[PDB]
Amino acid sequence: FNCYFPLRSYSFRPTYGVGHQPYRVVVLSFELLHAPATVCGPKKSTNLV
Amino acid sequence: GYFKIYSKHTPIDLPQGFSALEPLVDLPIGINITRFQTLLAL
Question: Glycosylation: which residues (chain B)?
Fold first, then answer.
């Protein structure tokens, strides 16, 4: 009484709605520090003439 | 913040001669360094 387990369980089924179906969410967070930046995007190259 | 390490291996008190030290590894550590010590194999 007046004491309930704070973590509740998702119940996902293949017969649920669009707002109740499980969604895999990944949050990409970017930080810039005084440390040297090293996470670069792909670098496009052109053929040599 | 860059850690540069140069090295040179030469087969032979310090010998009297000239030998430049080529760069070996650039380590992007970005920390502070003030003291050091070596390690020996016993």
Answer: 32
Resolution in A: 3.0
Q: Do A35 and B2 touch (CB under 8 A)?
A: no
Query: What is d(CA B31, CA B37) in angstroms, rounded to the nearest whole number?
Result: 17
Contact status of A35 with chain B (Cβ, < 8 Å):
yes
- Please enumerate in sequence order all residues whose Cβ is within 8 A of that of B17, keeping only pairs 6 or more positions apart, or say none: none
Q: In angstroms, what CA-CA distances link A13 with A8, A23, A26, A46?
A: 16, 12, 21, 49
**Is some CB atom of chain B closer than 8 A to the CB atom of A33?**
yes
What lies within 8 Å, CB to CB, of B4 at 6+ separation is B23, B25, B26, B27
